[PDB]
């Protein structure tokens, strides 16, 4: 039993639900809170953007330290840093950005990051301003991650179409 609230049920281990990720995460403070990050960990748009904003900047300035020790992330790929004041930890995993022209075909990767976590809150990857086809990432999502994971979904109306859709 754990405290997400309002989900629809899709899969055995996937939940669903038209939410506000920032808003979603200061009231459930998850143990494991996923960001749509780019591989420059540059929150400045989108769901990174508004994470970001919400910690007072201070997701920013941990990343940019993260970045110059470590140099950029992989697209697919994930690093653990803190969740601030919205969560334990902060999972920035970098889905494709087809407004970049990045192979769709690393979303799967991308959502493999989800099984290192048993339990995770989290955006549709490569989604909203990434620019893939929403209703191909929550498939993915759903063949991919096999860990228990609690999708919040931005715009109200879009979600309806997820879920009306949803095989
Ligand atoms: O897939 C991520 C989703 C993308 C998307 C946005 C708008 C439309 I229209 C269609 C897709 N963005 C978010 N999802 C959940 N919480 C959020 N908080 C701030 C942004 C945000
Ligand atoms: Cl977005």
């Given at each position: 039993?754990?405290?997400?609230?309002?989900?629809?049920?899709?899969?055995?281990?996937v939940?669903?639900?038209?939410?506000?990720?920032?808003?979603?995460?200061?009231?459930?403070?998850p143990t494991?809170?996923?960001?749509?990050?780019?591989?420059?960990?540059?929150?400045?748009?989108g769901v990174a953007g508004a994470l970001n904003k919400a910690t007072n900047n201070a997701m920013q300035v941990?990343?940019?330290?993260?970045?110059a020790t470590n140099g950029p992330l992989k697209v697919g790929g994930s690093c653990v840093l803190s969740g601030h004041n919205?969560?334990?930890?902060?999972?920035h995993?970098?889905?494709?950005?087809?407004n970049k022209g990045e192979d769709i075909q690393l979303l799967k990767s991308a959502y493999e990051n989800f099984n290192q976590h048993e339990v995770l809150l989290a955006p549709l990857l490569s989604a909203g301003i990434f620019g893939a086809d929403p209703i191909h990432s929550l498939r993915v999502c759903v063949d991919t991650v096999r860990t228990n994971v609690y999708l919040a979904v931005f715009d109200k109306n879009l979600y309806d179409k997820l879920?009306?859709?949803?095989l």
């Amino acid at each position: 039993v754990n405290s997400f609230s309002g989900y629809l049920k899709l899969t055995d281990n996937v939940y669903i639900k038209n939410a506000d990720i920032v808003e979603e995460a200061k009231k459930v403070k998850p143990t494991v809170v996923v960001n749509a990050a780019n591989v420059y960990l540059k929150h400045g748009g989108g769901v990174a953007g508004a994470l970001n904003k919400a910690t007072n900047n201070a997701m920013q300035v941990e990343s940019d330290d993260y970045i110059a020790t470590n140099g950029p992330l992989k697209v697919g790929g994930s690093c653990v840093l803190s969740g601030h004041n919205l969560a334990k930890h902060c999972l920035h995993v970098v889905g494709p950005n087809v407004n970049k022209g990045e192979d769709i075909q690393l979303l799967k990767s991308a959502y493999e990051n989800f099984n290192q976590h048993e339990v995770l809150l989290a955006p549709l990857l490569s989604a909203g301003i990434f620019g893939a086809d929403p209703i191909h990432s929550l498939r993915v999502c759903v063949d991919t991650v096999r860990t228990n994971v609690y999708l919040a979904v931005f715009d109200k109306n879009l979600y309806d179409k997820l879920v009306s859709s949803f095989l």
